[PDB]
Symmetry: C3
Subunit: 428 residues, 3 copies
């Protein structure tokens, strides 16, 4: 029923935002998988093998069983550490995209809200105009029954009337699909919304453009994310560079074995020389490894990593050049709106003088025909474009907030001042 | 020529649909790849080694040659079975995505079709207007030769006539590019298309809105595909969970081996030691394996898989809301159209009588030709919107079928009767 | 400030292009990582193991220390070669995707450039239009002081004037956002630009449409890319087929080893059985592999690759149809442009004489000045659409180059003295 109240409902169940939130959680949970390789690895394995000999190891043949519990532990390997750091960085980036998606739902709800309000005014002015054209037809049909005017008077007032009847539908339809889209973003239908209140509505000037621009540098989420991705691409070079380095792994195992020799030739061998042996061993061990050369694979991986970093740099610049033109065009548009409003307010008062003076004044004499209707078509156009400009202003205010990256639900809360009058979202 | 006639040719050569179809066949063929590890694995290998020994094994040498045929076979492993299930799931999802894409071709052909028809109307109404303004230039320029009118009217009617010539170009060119759109989809040029039969109409009230909802709910291809994706995500949770489980493998092999010894100090005491052995071995063997701890890896993967499933659920809820917004808006539009047709059908009769009765308003001076000049650009606007709403009605009929998920060839066959009259696509 | 000059600054620092270049430099570098498995792999490793043997393993302990330098070298493996061929293929595709992006920058700068000029023209005429409406408000307010007109005439001269005041602001604001769009591509603000010259202006008819298709057939980068993609798709089939062939690997190594046996059951007195050795080995060795059957995995992989090739085939068709649609749409557009130009060049002379002959019938007094109001809006709207068409034509020249696949810096030079008249971009 009110922008804030609407957003409140929208926020707690918007699937676009909730998907985003689930992406952030998984990203952060993946940190445990990335740390995984640094922690111990425990596993139990067992084996049976029945072999059967032939040719100077012929009549000798055996089946053997074993089982063992293995531990492995990675004392130092730089790749495994970088792998973790990278996932922390990845989860960091996902967090920012999620913050950016919170600001979109704000920016989108308002859009859908103000589109429904706009779709009303459009219909409402058409409505009032349909009647305004009608009253001209009514009078002319009276002024016809008793002489006075031709039929070249009736058909002008009938055509333009039948034109607007069809214009009423395309208008009435827009409102039904403005409301339906609001339901898509919010999750629920609204039979009424708080409309703009001309009594308590002021259009304040924004901070200087160079101050807005300076603030955006600090707080813009698009720009922030680009910095982190460059930070991410940098880290990835180290990872490629880690391939040259030594690695040391601890491994330990407990176990038992049993080989038994039975068969023709091995039915006794010299003096029990058939190795019927039940082994069993606790053992601990270290394995060192160092690459010396791998066909230039590692170097290639570094050089590739360095070029990608150049891309991430050039992407920071793209994000920046984008930020620089979003704060600037957002600034202009407010400065366009205030001017549009101030002009269109006097374009109404001017068109009001043409109504008050040449409409209500046109009872006797002067001019008839087309000069009758336009003294109000101008009054409606100006009235439409004025309310239109007012909503533009409101959205330009929110668009400057998101450029700064500081848009939250308190900027929707400030707009409870501008809204008051509950208005039907139904073509009555 | 006819709409279905056009679609038929498009359907069997369209590269987008056939790219889709091929993607769906790969998806299905991959089930054979995913099944693979469950089947037996056969392979042959061989090795040679020359060992020149120093240190405490100094003055000894060996040649060692071997060859063996290896068979492996997975007895039980859950994750391998999941692999297969997940590809069956993958292929199923692809077939639904292929169906959606069959429906888009129907949708997109009809659109391009009615664009070409639309572009003809625009052009031929601009054409009819061009002559209409011309006849008024002609009459004023000839009533000037007598000297009955001022030069401020022969230049006036010439000014409106030169605007319509320009408008006749950007309308001729629109038709050329509307046809090029239509060729891109179908594959071939068309010199003639069946345009609407402006006599026998098909304005028919659509199903109750909640029945349409009910049917979209269980037949929409987008919503079905979203449902299967969630099913897929859940199936992946179990796959992550499969990490903790034990596995059993068969590995049986036939092979032979040889070792031969040389070098200075190569024997030892009695029996002539370090002798050559010529092994030949038939072995069958099992290998049980059970992880216990893997540094919290599996556990992390199962949390990610759960968080992903949250996203897939929200994705469904998101796809749901889309459908709701589609049927309800396809409903509003098809009702807007129904009513819009009736209004412009009447606004044509209205703007008609304005140039039937005023077709004597130049035959004296009821309303000076200037009035009739810009009265002709009223009967043409009404006639434009009427055809415009008529085609937009036909598209809105398919759009609802699409939203119900049942858009078929029958829908196109039903529109043969609404067509019939062949109309040029390159007029003179 | 001239287009060519503008493009220079843009080209050297545009981040989208420089990202694309870094993408190509990395892809080419990837070839070294692709070739690497074919070259030697060299590595050093060392191992220590302590063990104690429980029961029958006879309380017999050991220390085991070893180190070894190991070389491995692929002798034949077709998959490895095939990996390298695919990477060259991949890098080549990038090169074309970079050539396309060198053309996009030209196309975009020209487009962003002309919108700025266009935004000035819109503003230029709107302002001159405002002086034109004010001209007639100035005179009506004069004619009311002595009292020759109804106060009704004043309001039409004012309420129509305030309308123009309003859409001069949205015209002014349009220019600033046009200059800001332009900055984003170039990185520079431009206070002055070289506007089009009305004389010194081209109108050359394009080559025959069939000649344009024939040249696009063998030079258009989009299908050049699509061809290489398909070429790539095939190369992957042969890669899937490599899975059946034999492989051979050379593996040489140098190393030393040392085991020692402590424990009270070794050092007693018997019975001399367990002895420790310090071994040193020089080893050279070959290893042969032939898969006989891998559970239908390779065959599935080949049949997958075959279907993927059908996709690439069908996408070559998709790419092709677009080209056809593009050259034909761009040919149609240049021919629309010339006609449009000639129409409006005639429709200016037409709107001229309509406010030249009516200009004379003002200084001697004739007809309605309300007619002279609407007459001046249609006098300027020919000028606004003429200069517009003239720019549209110039972009259409470039769109036919992009389609041929030969758009480069020379086409920006050809346009140099075609635009010599400098104009400001922030008029006060
Ligand atoms: Cl290397
Ligand atoms: Cl684990
Ligand atoms: Cl196979
Ligand atoms: K045998
Ligand atoms: K480099
Ligand atoms: K040595």
């Amino acid at each position: 029923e009110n922008l804030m109240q609407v957003y409140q409902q929208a926020r707690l169940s918007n699937p676009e935002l909730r998907k985003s939130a689930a992406d952030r959680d998984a990203a952060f949970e993946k940190i445990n998988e990335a740390r995984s390789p640094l922690l111990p690895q425990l596993g139990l394995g067992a084996d049976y093998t029945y072999s059967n000999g032939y040719r100077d190891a012929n009549g000798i043949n055996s089946n053997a069983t074993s089982a063992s519990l293995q531990l492995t532990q990675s004392i130092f390997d730089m790749s495994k550490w970088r792998a973790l750091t990278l996932q922390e960085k990845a989860a960091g980036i996902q967090d920012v995209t999620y913050q950016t998606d919170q600001q979109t739902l704000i920016l989108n709800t308002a859009t859908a809200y103000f589109n429904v309000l706009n779709a009303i005014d459009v219909l409402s002015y058409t409505q009032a105009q349909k009647e305004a054209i009608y009253r001209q037809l009514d009078q002319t049909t009276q002024r016809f029954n008793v002489g006075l005017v031709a039929i070249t008077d009736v058909q002008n007032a009938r055509a333009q009337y039948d034109t607007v009847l069809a214009n009423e539908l395309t208008a009435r339809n827009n409102l039904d699909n403005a409301v339906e889209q609001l339901r898509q973003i919010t999750g629920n239908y609204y039979p009424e919304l708080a409309a703009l209140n001309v009594e308590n509505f002021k259009t304040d000037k924004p901070q200087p453009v160079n101050a807005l621009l300076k603030e955006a540098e600090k707080r813009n989420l698009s720009l922030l994310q680009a910095r982190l991705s460059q930070d991410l691409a940098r880290e990835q070079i180290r990872q490629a560079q880690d391939g040259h380095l030594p690695t040391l792994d601890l491994t330990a195992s407990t176990g038992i074995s049993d080989t038994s020799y039975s068969g023709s030739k091995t039915r006794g061998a010299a003096g029990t020389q058939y190795d019927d042996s039940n082994m069993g061993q606790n053992k601990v061990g270290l394995s060192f490894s160092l690459p010396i050369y791998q066909g230039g694979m590692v170097n290639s991986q570094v050089k590739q990593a360095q070029y990608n970093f150049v891309g991430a740099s050039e992407q920071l610049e793209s994000a920046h050049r984008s930020v620089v033109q979003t704060v600037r065009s957002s600034f202009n548009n407010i400065n366009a709106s205030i001017s549009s409003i101030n002009a269109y307010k006097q374009a109404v008062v001017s068109a009001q003088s043409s109504l008050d003076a040449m409409e209500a004044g046109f009872s006797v004499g002067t001019e008839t025909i087309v000069d009758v209707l336009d003294a109000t078509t101008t009054l409606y156009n100006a009235k439409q474009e004025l309310a239109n400009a007012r909503y533009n202003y409101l959205i330009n205010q929110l668009n400057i907030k998101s450029a700064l990256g500081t848009l939250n639900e308190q900027d929707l809360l400030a707009l409870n001042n501008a809204l008051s009058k509950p208005v039907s979202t139904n073509p009555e």
